[PDB]
Amino acid sequence: ASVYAWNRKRISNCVADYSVLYNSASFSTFKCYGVSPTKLNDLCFTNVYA
Amino acid sequence: STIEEQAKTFLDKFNHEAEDLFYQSSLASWNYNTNITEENVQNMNNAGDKWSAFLKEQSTLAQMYPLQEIQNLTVKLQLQALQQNGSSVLSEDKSKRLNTILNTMSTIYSTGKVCNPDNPQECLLLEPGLNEIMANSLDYNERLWAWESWRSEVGKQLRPLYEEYVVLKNEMARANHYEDYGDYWRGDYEVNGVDGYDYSRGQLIEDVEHTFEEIKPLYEHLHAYVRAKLMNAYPSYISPIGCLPAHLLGDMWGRFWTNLYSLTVPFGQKPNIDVTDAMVDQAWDAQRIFKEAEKFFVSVGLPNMTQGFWENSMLTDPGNVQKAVCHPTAWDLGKGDFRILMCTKVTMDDFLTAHHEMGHIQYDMAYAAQPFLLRNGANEGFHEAVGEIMSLSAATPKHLKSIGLLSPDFQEDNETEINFLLKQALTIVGTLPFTYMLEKWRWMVFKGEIPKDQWMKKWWEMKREIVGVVEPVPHDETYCDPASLFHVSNDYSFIRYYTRTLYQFQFQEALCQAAKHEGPLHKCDISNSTEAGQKLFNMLRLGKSEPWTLALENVVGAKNMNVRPLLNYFEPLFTWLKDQNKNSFVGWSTDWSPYA
Amino acid sequence: GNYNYLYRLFRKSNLKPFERDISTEIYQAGSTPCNGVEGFNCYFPLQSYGFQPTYGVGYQPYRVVVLSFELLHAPATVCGPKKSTNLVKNKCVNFNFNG
Numbered sequence A: 001a002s003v004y005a006w007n008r009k010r011i012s013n014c015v016a017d018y019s020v021l022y023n024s025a026s027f028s029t030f031k032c033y034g035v036s037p038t039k040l041n042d043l044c045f046t047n048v049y050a
Numbered sequence B: 001s002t003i004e005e006q007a008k009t010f011l012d013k014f015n016h017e018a019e020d021l022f023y024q025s026s027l028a029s030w031n032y033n034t035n036i037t038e039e040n041v042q043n044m045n046n047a048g049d050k051w052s053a054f055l056k057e058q059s060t061l062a063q064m065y066p067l068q069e070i071q072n073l074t075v076k077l078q079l080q081a082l083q084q085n086g087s088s089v090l091s092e093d094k095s096k097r098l099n100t101i102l103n104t105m106s107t108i109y110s111t112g113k114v115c116n117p118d119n120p121q122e123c124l125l126l127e128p129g130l131n132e133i134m135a136n137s138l139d140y141n142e143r144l145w146a147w148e149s150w151r152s153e154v155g156k157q158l159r160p161l162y163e164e165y166v167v168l169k170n171e172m173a174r175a176n177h178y179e180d181y182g183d184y185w186r187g188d189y190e191v192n193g194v195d196g197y198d199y200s201r202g203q204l205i206e207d208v209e210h211t212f213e214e215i216k217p218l219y220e221h222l223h224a225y226v227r228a229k230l231m232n233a234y235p236s237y238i239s240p241i242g243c244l245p246a247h248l249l250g251d252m253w254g255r256f257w258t259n260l261y262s263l264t265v266p267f268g269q270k271p272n273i274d275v276t277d278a279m280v281d282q283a284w285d286a287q288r289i290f291k292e293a294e295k296f297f298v299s300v301g302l303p304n305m306t307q308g309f310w311e312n313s314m315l316t317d318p319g320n321v322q323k324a325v326c327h328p329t330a331w332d333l334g335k336g337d338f339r340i341l342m343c344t345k346v347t348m349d350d351f352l353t354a355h356h357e358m359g360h361i362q363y364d365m366a367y368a369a370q371p372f373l374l375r376n377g378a379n380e381g382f383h384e385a386v387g388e389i390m391s392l393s394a395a396t397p398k399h400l401k402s403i404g405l406l407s408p409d410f411q412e413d414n415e416t417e418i419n420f421l422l423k424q425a426l427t428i429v430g431t432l433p434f435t436y437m438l439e440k441w442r443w444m445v446f447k448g449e450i451p452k453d454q455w456m457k458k459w460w461e462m463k464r465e466i467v468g469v470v471e472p473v474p475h476d477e478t479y480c481d482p483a484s485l486f487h488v489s490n491d492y493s494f495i496r497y498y499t500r501t502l503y504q505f506q507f508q509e510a511l512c513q514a515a516k517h518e519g520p521l522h523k524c525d526i527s528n529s530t531e532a533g534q535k536l537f538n539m540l541r542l543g544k545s546e547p548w549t550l551a552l553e554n555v556v557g558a559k560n561m562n563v564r565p566l567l568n569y570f571e572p573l574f575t576w577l578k579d580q581n582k583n584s585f586v587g588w589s590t591d592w593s594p595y596a
Numbered sequence C: 001g002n003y004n005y006l007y008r009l010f011r012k013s014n015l016k017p018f019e020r021d022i023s024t025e026i027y028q029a030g031s032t033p034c035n036g037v038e039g040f041n042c043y044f045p046l047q048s049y050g051f052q053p054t055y056g057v058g059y060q061p062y063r064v065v066v067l068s069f070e071l072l073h074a075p076a077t078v079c080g081p082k083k084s085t086n087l088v089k090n091k092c093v094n095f096n097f098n099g
């Protein structure tokens, strides 16, 4: 989508594997604010907004 | 709300849409230059017409915002640049006539073909047919024939066209609240609104005369030495007391004296610093030339070239099937796209040209953070000067030894420095009186000091007085001798070379003082010095946002253009020329004593 | 040139966090009413990008995905994949079965 009409996908009731994203070589920026990438694969959240 | 916020939003819209339109136009020009085909010409013409119409519509929108209600200096500078009418203030018939005159002068200069009467079956164009004859021949009457025949054909075609051109450009300039077209050209150096750093249009001519009065003894000694050597080359034509014959200067017009280095060499017996054979022996590709130039620019601390530079530039001649312009040109296409179009050979000249054009690319990259209409040099002199300083630094024997191109047991004695400095003077110092005389003549033509029936009588009088060059035979008013040169026939300013030459040595002294070089100025190399690159990049990052006087304060610590760095650069050569001119007579006579 | 990507260039006020503005109403920069037509001091707020493959790295298109993690008083259901140690029997071990 365009940045004025940015797509929001609500992610619920599943298992989120964040190490697949973190260990990928295809991403240039993976800057996390408020949480560290190492404990993302452990913690649990109510909803994820993408 | 306020006028200033309205202008700021309008400038944001202008910047954003102009950057993409300028990209499209520049890409069309690039596709024409790397591929000379008729559809690329049509696409270039369509993009240029769209770009010019967009600039007309944005200037029309821009004039509705008055200047005096805006206090921010950058916003006022962009609005001042945009609100210029250009040719739009002139009537549509006269604007069409001026455009037609410019286009037909372009066709006459580009497709001008001249050869000897009674042998008309084939003829030679200016480049490269006449350039090689002017640069390499040793025959007096052949060079006289080529010079007089090309000024006969070109001047007799261009004289009524130039007479219309001066009147139309003066009409447009006085319609644009200028005194003449010369004042319009001098308005590039005009700084208004900055406390202390203001520069006036009338101060430029005074500063040029003040610097040229200090140029004059060095040029007189160089002219006397070149006169003595050309007297040795041509025994009877050149007089000891008079000016140089016009067709013997090594180029078509007298623009540069660098083709007389073979005839006027001080110490021919001593070797040269030619590194061509060393690159041929090590098989240096043009890619290696540009990588060594990039290594030079990363050694001083400047940013290295983008990936898109290496992907998208044409650094080698494509072949017979594909046609391209051979002239080396650095392209700032917009949006972070930087390319070099050069047909690079394995020569020293192409290596120095690669450094010069990559200096142009570095200058273009430095002001990429600026808004679009401020993406230029602070004046027209800085843009060429930052390439010429790289040409100065790369040409040094220390740089050649550092990159391995010169033998480490090469002996650097005083004689090689003298003849190298003489070559640099024939290239650099010799163009200064010709440039000053041409610009002063054009300023007097636009100002109306010289009537149309008296253009040439004054002009040769100026050339004898300033350049020290005499006409072979007298010319009447059917000739148009200035307009045989590319820049004047195609509506280009010419004082940029004078300002470039002085700014070159001012920047050279500033960076060598930054680099803590302890010897002669011409022995100085700016590699390995991070602080010199930082001092350069402080001015380079500004672009057109700041006045050129403030930028010159940022580099050299002076508020005005200065002539002393040039004299300091050539001071060993100046003392050597003063020693060599004891028997001979320095200076020339304006009389017809050699030949007329 | 890929002109399928738009961005808002002008708005009267700054956006709130996680706000989407898809309005296509003419921005009024001046005192005069726009009246729905793009004239003088009145600009269309959405402007197209012009992505090309020959662009610089500061102008090339970048796809950005922002993941927002919030904890609310409802039971958290998006959990990570807890790793499982192979089962060992007949030994005194510390077992952790489903908490």
Ligand SMILES: *[C@@H]1O[C@H](CO)[C@@H](O)[C@H](O)[C@H]1NC(C)=O
Pocket: B035, B037, B322
């Ligand atoms: C140059 O133009 C010709 C003519 O169509 C074309 O075949 C060729 O691919 C072009 N080359 C480049 C490098 O664009």
Ligand SMILES: *[C@@H]1O[C@H](CO)[C@@H](O)[C@H](O)[C@H]1NC(C)=O
Pocket: B008, B072, B073, B074, B075
């Ligand atoms: C002038 O405007 C530019 C942006 O348009 C801004 O960054 C700068 O701070 C302004 N200068 C002053 C003195 O307000």
Ligand SMILES: *[C@@H]1O[C@H](CO)[C@@H](O)[C@H](O)[C@H]1NC(C)=O
Pocket: B063, B083, B084, B085, B089, B175, B176, B177
């Ligand atoms: C441009 O031309 C228009 C009409 O000829 C005039 O009103 C305006 O003042 C001119 N602008 C400048 C900067 O001379």
Ligand SMILES: *[C@@H]1O[C@H](CO)[C@@H](O)[C@H](O)[C@H]1NC(C)=O
Pocket: B304, B305, B306, B307
């Ligand atoms: C420019 O330099 C950086 C860091 O020194 C390097 O990562 C990059 O690859 C260089 N660019 C090119 C085109 O080699």
Ligand SMILES: *[C@@H]1O[C@H](CO)[C@@H](O)[C@H](O)[C@H]1NC(C)=O
Pocket: B414, B415, B418, B576
């Ligand atoms: C070079 O130096 C030597 C020794 O000092 C001297 O004899 C010679 O004249 C000098 N040559 C030049 C051109 O300065």
Ligand SMILES: *[C@@H]1O[C@H](CO)[C@@H](O)[C@H](O)[C@H]1NC(C)=O
Pocket: B299, B402, B527, B528
């Ligand atoms: C400048 O730095 C490069 C990089 O190490 C080096 O090879 C070169 O010799 C240096 N220049 C001088 C004059 O030492």
